[PDB]
Amino acid sequence: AAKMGKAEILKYILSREIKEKPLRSLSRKFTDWAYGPVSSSLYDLTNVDTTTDNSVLEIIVYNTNIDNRHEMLTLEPLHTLLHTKWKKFAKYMFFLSFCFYFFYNITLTLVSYYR
Amino acid sequence: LQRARTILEFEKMLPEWLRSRFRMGELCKVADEDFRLCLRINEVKWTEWKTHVSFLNEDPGPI
Amino acid sequence: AVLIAAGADVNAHAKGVFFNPKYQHEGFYFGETPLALAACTNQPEIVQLLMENEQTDITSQDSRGNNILHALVTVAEDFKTQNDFVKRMYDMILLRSGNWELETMRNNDGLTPLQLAAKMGKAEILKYILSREIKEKPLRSLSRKFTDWAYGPVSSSLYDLTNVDTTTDNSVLEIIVYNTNIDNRHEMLTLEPLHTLLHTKWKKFAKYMFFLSFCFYFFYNITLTLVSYYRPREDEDLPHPLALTHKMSWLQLLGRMFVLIWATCISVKEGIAIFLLRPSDLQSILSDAWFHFVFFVQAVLVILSVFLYLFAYKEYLACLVLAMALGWANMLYYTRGFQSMGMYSVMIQKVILHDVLKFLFVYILFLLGFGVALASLIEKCSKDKKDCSSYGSFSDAVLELFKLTIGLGDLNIQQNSTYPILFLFLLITYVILTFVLLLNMLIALMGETVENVSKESERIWRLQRARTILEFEKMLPEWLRSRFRMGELCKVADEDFRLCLRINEVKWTEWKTHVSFLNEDPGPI
Amino acid sequence: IQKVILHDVLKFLFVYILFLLGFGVALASLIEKCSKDKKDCSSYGSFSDAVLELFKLTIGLGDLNIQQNSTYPILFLFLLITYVILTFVLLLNMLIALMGETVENVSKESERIWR
Ligand SMILES: CCCCCCCC/C=C/CCCCCCCC(=O)O[C@@H](COC(=O)CCCCCCCCCCCCCCC)COP(=O)([O-])OCC[N+](C)(C)C
Ligand SMILES: CCCCCCCC/C=C/CCCCCCCC(=O)O[C@@H](COC(=O)CCCCCCCCCCCCCCC)COP(=O)([O-])OCC[N+](C)(C)C
Ligand SMILES: CCCCCCCC/C=C\CCCCCCCC(=O)O[C@@H](COC(=O)CCCCCCCCCCCCCCC)COP(=O)([O-])OCC[N+](C)(C)C
Ligand SMILES: CCCCCCCC/C=C\CCCCCCCC(=O)O[C@@H](COC(=O)CCCCCCCCCCCCCCC)COP(=O)([O-])OCC[N+](C)(C)C
Ligand SMILES: CCCCCCCC/C=C\CCCCCCCC(=O)O[C@@H](COC(=O)CCCCCCCCCCCCCCC)COP(=O)([O-])OCC[N+](C)(C)C
Ligand SMILES: CCCCCCCC/C=C\CCCCCCCC(=O)O[C@@H](COC(=O)CCCCCCCCCCCCCCC)COP(=O)([O-])OCC[N+](C)(C)C
Ligand SMILES: CCCCCCCC/C=C\CCCCCCCC(=O)O[C@@H](COC(=O)CCCCCCCCCCCCCCC)COP(=O)([O-])OCC[N+](C)(C)C
Ligand SMILES: CCCCCCCC/C=C\CCCCCCCC(=O)O[C@@H](COC(=O)CCCCCCCCCCCCCCC)COP(=O)([O-])OCC[N+](C)(C)C
Ligand SMILES: CCCCCCCC/C=C\CCCCCCCC(=O)O[C@@H](COC(=O)CCCCCCCCCCCCCCC)COP(=O)([O-])OCC[N+](C)(C)C
Ligand SMILES: CCCCCCCC/C=C\CCCCCCCC(=O)O[C@@H](COC(=O)CCCCCCCCCCCCCCC)COP(=O)([O-])OCC[N+](C)(C)C
Ligand SMILES: CCCCCCCC/C=C\CCCCCCCC(=O)O[C@@H](COC(=O)CCCCCCCCCCCCCCC)COP(=O)([O-])OCC[N+](C)(C)C
Ligand SMILES: CCCCCCCC/C=C\CCCCCCCC(=O)O[C@@H](COC(=O)CCCCCCCCCCCCCCC)COP(=O)([O-])OCC[N+](C)(C)C
Ligand code: NA
Ligand code: NA
């Protein structure tokens, strides 16, 4: 479904929640607790995070064939998962890549202007 | 979408011991003899009032 | 119902940390009592069942001092997210209580439920309270809006001004104008008693104090300009004219004395105002205290140039010229006295922040980047003739590319370059990026900005004028505050005298027999 | 033409003249006397002369010489670039965008106004 860009089916599978008791273990979304209007849910990450090969997240980002990649990344477990990777490690590696490339351009400029 | 490609390219050049330090999700028991890694999202809904029946924990705090 | 009949305590307080959460997603605050829980979860039949029991204490307070009405204000949200149940729960509990005990109670911050709604920006609840009108006879004195007379489609109403006008501390009007936290101040000032009240203050005193502030600041800039343009330019005529360092009995000497005195008065007045309203937020520095900052810098540069001449350090002339240029630019503050020019100044502020700053960042990158590459391609000109290239250094190349952008001068492609074809390639690439792409895209992006903010620019202007009105009101003497008095004293109920504001109205669509009124005879009496 | 003059052009001219006359006095009072050996050492030598130079810059005629007879040459260049940003980048481009809003509204009614 991720490979062929079927966004309606993909939304249904990633957030499937079965409240009936004998078939509850077929869910991928679970309610952990609730009180009044407030609740907290858990989303299954088994074959969607990048800990295995050909995961759902990797297939969507690198899929040059389909035309709706930027709509499929709005879906519910994928959006928070990219946010968590940016906050923990990815924002600091991006700043360090900027600093090394800036110092590379400064030095190349100064040795060419002051020949 | 452009920033997402930058994130996954940074993730592949990390050593395997450092991939284990930055770990998305928590190990949870969702059913009898069924342990899955899960991601937590909170929510507030004011429009559909129902009696809550299906839950994993009776006590609703951060535990 | 089975538990209450068997002796369950109807006054218990759930006071744990889950019921008083530090962050929003970790719990659910509702006011800690069983009556408040049933109201906040939209259960109107349990609320009715609880209030009929005579053991239920309807006026109790929780750990932070909130009663039942404070708690409903805290959980309220707008119509798209929550519908209108919270407003309906407020009305049902208030009428059952039957007096003014609940709405005059203060929490641990010292706030009534009316003050708390203004502080938290709850616009739906605030609209309901300010215009509450109860037509049923025994509960009529709980109203804040009264019908004075009516005849056919024409009627005249009175609005209670008790804790909303600025005659007391922490009034509703003052809380809304100075609330830098919320994002909907300019929507809340459209509400019914607040809008006419600002109109009345402008007509009676505030429009005349605004004109007098303009005249004094204009004469201050005229005199500062004339004594700086007409300095004694002679080397032998040393003394600076400002403040009369050599008393010479010259007529019109008082303008040179006016500038030194008036610059001190600005620097004290703006020194106090920046102290009392200090922002912890850069968006509030630009949206409230901008013209406090730039009037203060201008007055300091005038005082600082006086000390530099009296010690003769020659840098006094630089401080004077920066003070003149900033002074005439500061005249744009006074456009907010008109609707047409005031909305135009709102547009200027939005276009600078959304469009102009992004353009300047990319343009300077292209200017400095192409500037070094062209300058390092030019050979030495120490041989026979001088003046063989205008791109001979980095400073010279940047100046030539800047003049090309604004279209001044001439273009010579015959420089002293080692590679003349490569020189022309880089120069044409610069023209395409700036003349064809970036300047034309700036015009198109401004068209999108103008379309969005034109919907809101009238309400943003009225918020700016409202801050000017309340600042003028605080500098009046107490005997003169009594002369300009909003409202009239009216008898709205038996032994109940309130200050009220009158608003007239014509309604052609709902025909009814008029029953509730304060006066049988409908004229101006 | 009548609607654009009244709604857009008159507001532009008021703010432009304030910037023109205000920056004109400040630049002119920074220029030294030219009574010594050579004449014609500055084109900003008076208030009338400085206003003419800033007007020609706006409509793009002539040449630009930053080497005047200023006491403080860096301060002279700072005020001149600030004038360019306020008029060339901000006010002239915003005028085009505001005319687009005026054309959209009055095009609905312009046939009935003509009749
Ligand atoms: C401290 C010196 C500042 C200027 C320095 C220049 C470079 C630094 C630039 C820094 C970034 C600029 C961003 C400014 C954003 C807000 C501007 C603004 O208020 O827009 C207003 C337009 O009228 C103006 O005042 C704008 C004109 C530009 C400033 C004048 C240039 C200086 C002139 C001479 C140069 C001498 C400089 C001498 C000192 C170096 C209208 O806005 P508003 O809708 O009414 O809402 C704000 C008002 N409110 C907050 C009360 C509600
Ligand atoms: C698309 C159009 C827009 C373009 C805009 C950007 C384009 C910028 C264009 C730049 C072209 C000018 C540089 C060429 C070099 C000339 C020589 C020179 O004197 O350089 C000197 C440095 O000069 C400076 O430091 C410049 C000072 C102004 C800085 C930017 C203005 C701030 C605007 C804020 C207002 C914001 C408004 C408020 C916001 C609402 C030193 O070099 P030198 O070799 O030693 O020279 C001899 C020195 N001597 C002269 C004393 C003897
Ligand atoms: C907890 C957060 C940090 C955790 C991870 C940190 C360790 C790193 C993890 C793994 C090691 C890195 C593998 C190879 C590195 C090669 C470097 C290189 O060629 O540049 C690469 C940047 O590469 C970067 O990731 C930027 C940071 C430099 C890493 C240097 C490691 C030492 C740490 C710091 C040393 C002392 C500094 C101390 C600073 C205080 C190329 O950049 P690019 O963006 O990939 O490609 C260009 C853009 N493009 C896509 C358009 C083409
Ligand atoms: C019935 C209607 C009138 C009733 C009230 C009248 C009495 C006054 C009431 C109270 C007294 C005033 C208190 C202090 C005054 C200090 C002056 C000063 O520093 O300038 C202040 C203006 O201040 C003004 O209000 C403008 C009018 C000057 C008041 C002078 C009183 C004598 C009256 C006239 C004398 C003879 C003239 C005769 C004319 C025919 C500063 O202006 P600002 O706007 O506050 O701040 C700058 C803008 N900013 C916010 C961006 C920073
Ligand atoms: C225009 C100059 C061009 C050249 C300037 C160059 C720089 C340009 C810089 C900025 C451009 C803007 C310039 C500022 C304009 C003036 C301020 C103002 O707004 O006045 C306003 C009111 O003020 C009046 O009452 C009108 C003046 C009548 C005389 C009253 C004198 C007061 C003394 C009496 C007491 C004596 C007490 C003293 C002794 C005790 C006019 O606005 P309005 O729209 O008519 O108000 C109605 C608004 N409403 C309909 C929405 C409700
Ligand atoms: C074309 C004939 C041939 C040439 C004739 C040449 C000579 C012509 C002489 C005089 C006519 C000059 C204009 C005066 C009338 C403007 C009307 C207007 O819309 O004002 C508006 C603002 O506009 C201002 O008033 C702001 C200041 C403008 C500067 C002129 C001072 C006004 C007093 C005149 C003294 C003269 C000083 C200037 C001397 C040149 C009114 O403000 P507002 O009501 O709050 O906002 C409107 C929005 N609303 C309608 C929905 C509420
Ligand atoms: C000019 C004189 C020097 C000033 C320098 C420092 C001034 C900076 C101080 C204050 C302005 C910073 C923003 C604070 C308020 C945010 C609101 C906003 O509109 O920002 C916008 C622009 O912001 C950017 O991201 C542009 C990137 C660079 C801006 C700063 C460097 C100036 C570039 C070279 C200039 C030097 C040239 C000098 C020589 C020619 C964010 O983009 P947005 O999405 O459209 O915002 C929508 C609103 N929102 C945030 C709520 C979503
Ligand atoms: C408050 C903050 C706002 C300030 C303004 C805003 C920030 C503006 C940012 C930067 C402005 C200044 C840039 C640094 C260079 C200094 C210039 C210099 O000193 O010239 C000297 C060094 O010149 C060189 O060595 C060659 C150039 C080196 C830097 C390469 C520029 C490309 C950067 C591209 C990306 C940069 C930007 C990226 C996008 C933003 C020599 O030059 P000269 O011609 O031989 O001098 C003759 C006189 N003299 C012989 C007596 C000495
Ligand atoms: C995917 C495709 C995109 C990229 C494609 C390339 C890949 C990039 C990789 C490498 C770059 C290849 C150049 C090698 C470096 C040599 C430079 C050199 O010698 O200067 C040469 C000029 O050079 C130019 O003017 C053109 C350079 C850019 C070519 C790319 C065209 C861009 C498309 C736009 C198409 C229109 C542009 C055509 C404009 C001519 C000649 O030097 P000279 O000054 O003549 O010698 C002195 C004069 N004399 C003869 C009297 C003795
Ligand atoms: C040009 C020659 C000298 C003329 C001077 C006197 C001419 C004045 C005579 C008549 C025009 C005045 C308006 C009367 C009719 C109102 C309709 C209107 O569109 O006005 C608008 C502009 O009005 C302003 O407020 C602009 C502020 C200054 C205008 C007057 C000074 C000119 C500035 C310097 C020029 C001198 C430059 C000379 C040297 C270069 C009001 O804004 P609006 O909200 O968009 O209006 C919508 C319609 N409404 C009112 C129904 C709401
Ligand atoms: C019908 C109404 C429409 C009329 C047109 C529209 C109205 C236009 C408004 C104004 C136009 C005229 C401005 C007044 C100055 C007179 C100029 C002068 O006489 O020069 C003399 C005085 O020059 C000086 O003393 C220095 C400048 C003083 C005023 C400061 C201007 C800043 C105002 C900023 C805000 C103002 C605007 C605010 C926004 C609107 C000397 O100058 P000179 O170079 O040495 O002369 C040489 C020849 N001579 C030696 C033989 C003598
Ligand atoms: C909240 C922050 C906003 C406000 C910040 C400041 C607060 C305002 C409060 C006080 C103003 C501070 C200046 C003190 C007065 C001294 C003036 C002076 O001596 O002239 C100086 C130049 O001066 C300049 O060119 C820059 C002046 C404006 C600086 C503000 C930058 C605006 C942001 C835009 C950033 C880019 C702008 C950078 C452009 C350089 C030097 O004089 P000179 O001509 O060199 O001397 C003769 C030449 N000689 C050396 C050969 C012998
Ligand atoms: Na031109
Ligand atoms: Na030209």
From Swiss-Prot, chain A:
Q: Where are the ANK repeats?
A: 1-15, 51-73
TM spans (from-to): 84-113
| Compartments where located | Cell membrane; Cytoplasm; Lysosome
Tissue and organ distribution: Expressed in keratinocytes and hair follicles.
**Signal peptide interval:** none
Functional description taken from the UniProt entry: Non-selective calcium permeant cation channel. It is activated by innocuous (warm) temperatures and shows an increased response at noxious temperatures greater than 39 degrees Celsius. Activation exhibits an outward rectification. The channel pore can dilate to provide permeability to larger cations. May associate with TRPV1 and may modulate its activity. Is a negative regulator of hair growth and cycling: TRPV3-coupled signaling suppresses keratinocyte proliferation in hair follicles and induces apoptosis and premature hair follicle regression (catagen).
According to the record's subunit comment, the protein's assembly and interactions are:
Homotetramer. May convert from a homotetramer to a homopentamer to allow pore dilation. Interacts with TRPV1; may form a heteromeric channel with TRPV1. Interacts with SNX11; this interaction promotes TRPV3 trafficking from the cell membrane to lysosome for degradation.
Q: Hey, which family's this protein in?
A: Belongs to the transient receptor (TC 1.A.4) family. TrpV subfamily. TRPV3 sub-subfamily.
Q: Any idea what this protein is called?
A: Transient receptor potential cation channel subfamily V member 3
Q: Which organism is it from?
A: Mus musculus
Gene behind the chain: Trpv3
Which stretch of the intact protein is present? 348 to 462 of 791
From Swiss-Prot, chain B:
Residues on the membrane's Cytoplasmic side span 1-63
- Describe, from its UniProt entry, the tissues in which this protein is expressed: Expressed in keratinocytes and hair follicles.
Provide the protein's localization.
Cell membrane; Cytoplasm; Lysosome
* Self-association and partners: Homotetramer. May convert from a homotetramer to a homopentamer to allow pore dilation. Interacts with TRPV1; may form a heteromeric channel with TRPV1. Interacts with SNX11; this interaction promotes TRPV3 trafficking from the cell membrane to lysosome for degradation.
Q: What does this protein do?
A: Non-selective calcium permeant cation channel. It is activated by innocuous (warm) temperatures and shows an increased response at noxious temperatures greater than 39 degrees Celsius. Activation exhibits an outward rectification. The channel pore can dilate to provide permeability to larger cations. May associate with TRPV1 and may modulate its activity. Is a negative regulator of hair growth and cycling: TRPV3-coupled signaling suppresses keratinocyte proliferation in hair follicles and induces apoptosis and premature hair follicle regression (catagen).
As for family, the record states: Belongs to the transient receptor (TC 1.A.4) family. TrpV subfamily. TRPV3 sub-subfamily.
Q: What is this protein called?
A: Transient receptor potential cation channel subfamily V member 3
Naturally occurring in which organism (per UniProt): Mus musculus
Taxonomic classification:
Eukaryota, Metazoa, Chordata, Craniata, Vertebrata
From Swiss-Prot, chain C:
Give the superkingdom in one word: Eukaryota
GO biological process, alphabetically ordered:
negative regulation of hair cycle; positive regulation of calcium ion import; response to temperature stimulus
Regions crossing the membrane? 200-229, 249-277, 289-309, 315-335, 339-377, 419-455
The UniProt note on how this protein's activity is regulated states: Activated by cannabinoid that binds to the vanilloid binding pocket. Diphenylboronic anhydride induces pore dilation and enhances cation permeability by promoting the conversion to a homopentamer.
Where does the entry say this protein is expressed, by tissue? Expressed in keratinocytes and hair follicles.
Extracellular compartment spans: 230-248, 310-314, 378-389, 416-418
Where's it found, cell-wise?
Cell membrane; Cytoplasm; Lysosome
**What are the intramembrane segments of this chain?**
390-415
Reactions it catalyzes: Ca(2+)(in) = Ca(2+)(out); Mg(2+)(in) = Mg(2+)(out); Na(+)(in) = Na(+)(out); K(+)(in) = K(+)(out)
Give membrane topology per the record.
Multi-pass membrane protein
Q: Does the keyword Metal-binding apply?
A: yes
Q: Which residues lie on this side of the membrane: Cytoplasmic?
A: 278-288, 336-338, 456-525
Alphabetical UniProt keywords: ANK repeat, Calcium, Calcium channel, Calcium transport, Cell membrane, Cytoplasm, Ion channel, Ion transport, Lysosome, Membrane, Metal-binding, Repeat, Sodium, Transmembrane, Transmembrane helix, Transport
**What broad class describes the main subcellular location of this protein?**
membrane
**One cellular-component annotation, GO:** plasma membrane
Q: Is the Cytoplasm keyword given for this protein? A: yes
* ANK repeat segments: 30-60, 67-99, 109-131, 167-189
Name the residues that bind Na(+): G407
What does the annotation say about its assembly with partners?
Homotetramer. May convert from a homotetramer to a homopentamer to allow pore dilation. Interacts with TRPV1; may form a heteromeric channel with TRPV1. Interacts with SNX11; this interaction promotes TRPV3 trafficking from the cell membrane to lysosome for degradation.
Please give the family membership noted in the entry. Answer: Belongs to the transient receptor (TC 1.A.4) family. TrpV subfamily. TRPV3 sub-subfamily.
Protein name (Swiss-Prot/TrEMBL): Transient receptor potential cation channel subfamily V member 3
Gene that encodes the chain = Trpv3
Relative to the complete UniProt sequence, the shown stretch is: 232 to 756 of 791
